Amino acid sequence: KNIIIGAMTALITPFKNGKVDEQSYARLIKRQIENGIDAVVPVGTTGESATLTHEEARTCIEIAVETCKGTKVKVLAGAGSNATHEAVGLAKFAKEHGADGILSVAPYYNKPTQQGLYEHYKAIAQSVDIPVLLYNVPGRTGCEISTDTIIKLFRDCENIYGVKEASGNIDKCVDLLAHEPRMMLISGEDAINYPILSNGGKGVISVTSNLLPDMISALTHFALDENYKEAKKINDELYNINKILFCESNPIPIKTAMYLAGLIESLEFRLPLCSPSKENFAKIEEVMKKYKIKGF
Amino acid sequence: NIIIGAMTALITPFKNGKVDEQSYARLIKRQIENGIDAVVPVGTTGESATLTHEEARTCIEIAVETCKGTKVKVLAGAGSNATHEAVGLAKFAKEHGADGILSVAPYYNKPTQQGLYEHYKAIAQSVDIPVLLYNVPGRTGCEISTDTIIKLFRDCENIYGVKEASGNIDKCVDLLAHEPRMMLISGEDAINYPILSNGGKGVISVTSNLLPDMISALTHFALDENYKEAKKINDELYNINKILFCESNPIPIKTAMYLAGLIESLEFRLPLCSPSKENFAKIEEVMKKYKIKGF
Numbered sequence: 001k002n003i004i005i006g007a008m009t010a011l012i013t014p015f016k017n018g019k020v021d022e023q024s025y026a027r028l029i030k031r032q033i034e035n036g037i038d039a040v041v042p043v044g045t046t047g048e049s050a051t052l053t054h055e056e057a058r059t060c061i062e063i064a065v066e067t068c069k070g071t072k073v074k075v076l077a078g079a080g081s082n083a084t085h086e087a088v089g090l091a092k093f094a095k096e097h098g099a100d101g102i103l104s105v106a107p108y109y110n111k112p113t114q115q116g117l118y119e120h121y122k123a124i125a126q127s128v129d130i131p132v133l134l135y136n137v138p139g140r141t142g143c144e145i146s147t148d149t150i151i152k153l154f155r156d157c158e159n160i161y162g163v164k165e166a167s168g169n170i171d172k173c174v175d176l177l178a179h180e181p182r183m184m185l186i187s188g189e190d191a192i193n194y195p196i197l198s199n200g201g202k203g204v205i206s207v208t209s210n211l212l213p214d215m216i217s218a219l220t221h222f223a224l225d226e227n228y229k230e231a232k233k234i235n236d237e238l239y240n241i242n243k244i245l246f247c248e249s250n251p252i253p254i255k256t257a258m259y260l261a262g263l264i265e266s267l268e269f270r271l272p273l274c275s276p277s278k279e280n281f282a283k284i285e286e287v288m289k290k291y292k293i294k295g296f
Numbered sequence: 297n298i299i300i301g302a303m304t305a306l307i308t309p310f311k312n313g314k315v316d317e318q319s320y321a322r323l324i325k326r327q328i329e330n331g332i333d334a335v336v337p338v339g340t341t342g343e344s345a346t347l348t349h350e351e352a353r354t355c356i357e358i359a360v361e362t363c364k365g366t367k368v369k370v371l372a373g374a375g376s377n378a379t380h381e382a383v384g385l386a387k388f389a390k391e392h393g394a395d396g397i398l399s400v401a402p403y404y405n406k407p408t409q410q411g412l413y414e415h416y417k418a419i420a421q422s423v424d425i426p427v428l429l430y431n432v433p434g435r436t437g438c439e440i441s442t443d444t445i446i447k448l449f450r451d452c453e454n455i456y457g458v459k460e461a462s463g464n465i466d467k468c469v470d471l472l473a474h475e476p477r478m479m480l481i482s483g484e485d486a487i488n489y490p491i492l493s494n495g496g497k498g499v500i501s502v503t504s505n506l507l508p509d510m511i512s513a514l515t516h517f518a519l520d521e522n523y524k525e526a527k528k529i530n531d532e533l534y535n536i537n538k539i540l541f542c543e544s545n546p547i548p549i550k551t552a553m554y555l556a557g558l559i560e561s562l563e564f565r566l567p568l569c570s571p572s573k574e575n576f577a578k579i580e581e582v583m584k585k586y587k588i589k590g591f
């Protein structure tokens with residue numbers, strides 16, 4: 001199979017006066033590239049995919065593809081939807097606009113059955129020729145992609161090569177790689193990046209990497225080089241910022257951190273997302289001071 | 297200014313991948329003719345997530361014109377997890393003859409209480425028809441707290457209550473004990489009577505798609521404070537109320553409607569699919585204990 005692995009960043013989408021700051025987005029992507037990142041995930045959950053227009057989503061995917069031209073960094077475009085015809089369309093666009101692959105979150109709100117999830121992803125896989133990474137996050141979707149469904153999808157569709165797990169369930173990641181050791185298991189939860197990597201995972205899709213791309217990039221490469229002591233050490237040091245970046249729902253804290261770090265101008269969200277509480281604002285600032293944030 | 301009583305979350309029938317518009321209108325007239333007080337087009341039961349904005353509009357219009365000339369009101373589904381999308385949906389609804397909007401809490405992106413407050417204020421201050429909140433944390437990933445609902449009720453005149461689908465009777469005490477003027481609407485058919493018996497003023501029912509007369513009688517008995525007859529119907533409906541969630545709504549109800557000959561094809565839009573063979577037979581079993589009205 002063709003795969004997209006390693007240290008990857010779920011890119012934030014900066015806003016200036018309610019519009020996508022295109023120069024900032026492009027500017028943030030280059031900062032990721034220059035810090036050892038292997039792939040970028042535009043218009044994911046951290047990128048506020050739910051509140052972006054279909055026209056803004058295509059702009060941000062094009063900025064990513066165009067900023068990584070001439071580099072080793074791949075673009076894993078977010079193209080999920082809880083409507084299958086909608087997800088197929090997004091996957092088709094992302095392919096035709098130069099993305100190296102698609103990240104496709106499990107359907108949210110409507111809670112499809114395991115059979116429905118199978119047909120949903122099969123339709124998506126039959127929609128493009130680029131690699132397809134599943135994304136399982138039950139805390140947001142209301143549903144779980146079972147291990148059986150993932151493995152059946154892995155064996156029945158050539159594009160489906162692994163899963164981004166954000167379920168806090170190390171048991172499931174043992175289950176996956178013990179029955180299908182060929183899949184690419186990707187960490188979607190920064191705090192347990194090393195434990196996921198140490199069991200055979202081949203990359204991360206990180207929130208923290210928005211702020212400390214070099215440290216997440218270092219964590220992954222130590223792990224992939226089987227330097228588990230160096231990987232766990234970085235994992236251990238990052239635990240505090242990894243948890244505090246979820247004091248409120250992602251991406252409220254990470255954008256707050258970027259703003260405090262002077263990496264984006266203005267702390268702008270799209271409703272129903274909004275600035276954090278005063279308490280959370282101050283707590284974020286406290287945790288940040290214990291870490292060295294790279295500039296541009 | 298409210299919309300209460302027995303209401304149906306209409307299923308959305310498909311024929312060859314398209315919305316069977318004549319079957320949709322014929323199902324609405326069957327609800328009207330069986331004592332239902334309002335219809336909820338393109339809600340969760342109507343597969344709102346997988347319909348296009350153009351189809352959503354079509355079913356809202358079919359509902360308004362099929363209920364034109366009747367006392368039956370239209371509570372159109374117009375929620376979204378993007379506020380600008382929810383505002384736009386509310387405006388159309390208004391522009392299109394709907395008597396009000398049902399606005400589900402934002403799903404997937406998990407906004408804070410402050411974000412949910414501003415989300416609903418934006419919707420409410422943008423249109424003038426009544427707005428019923430819809431709280432179903434099992435699907436959205438978020439809960440509209442009791443404080444937030446009450447604040448919305450008190451700060452916006454358009455927001456008049458909440459449809460609760462959280463299986464949390466404690467919260468329904470919490471709501472009506474601190475704000476007894478709001479309209480609490482049950483979103484869980486199995487506990488329709490307990491919610492009504494605490495001061496609830498209506499239901500938005502899945503079961504009413506198949507047995508509209510039974511849900512209609514249950515609600516009106518309760519609103520008439522005939523709780524013994526209301527509970528009696530609620531108890532008789534438990535089996536079908538429960539089996540109708542053997543898989544996620546509306547997979548079972550469409551199976552029931554199809555089995556009963558009320559729709560002609562068992563068609564879903566993906567990622568929704570027909571149920572397992574096992575659940576198909578169980579739904580078929582439970583139906584046999586109920587008298588299903590035709591057209």
Ligand SMILES: N[C@@H](CCCC[NH3+])C(=O)O
Nearest residue numbers: 049050051052053054378
């Ligand atoms: N807000 C809707 C539509 C998203 C359209 C692309 N950003 C959803 O999350 O499914």
Ligand SMILES: N[C@@H](CCCC[NH3+])C(=O)O
Nearest residue numbers: 082083344345346347349
């Ligand atoms: N299926 C997407 C698109 C919106 C159309 C129906 N609300 C969503 O649930 O947000």
Ligand SMILES: [Mg+2]
Nearest residue numbers: 442443470474
């Ligand atoms: Mg309270």
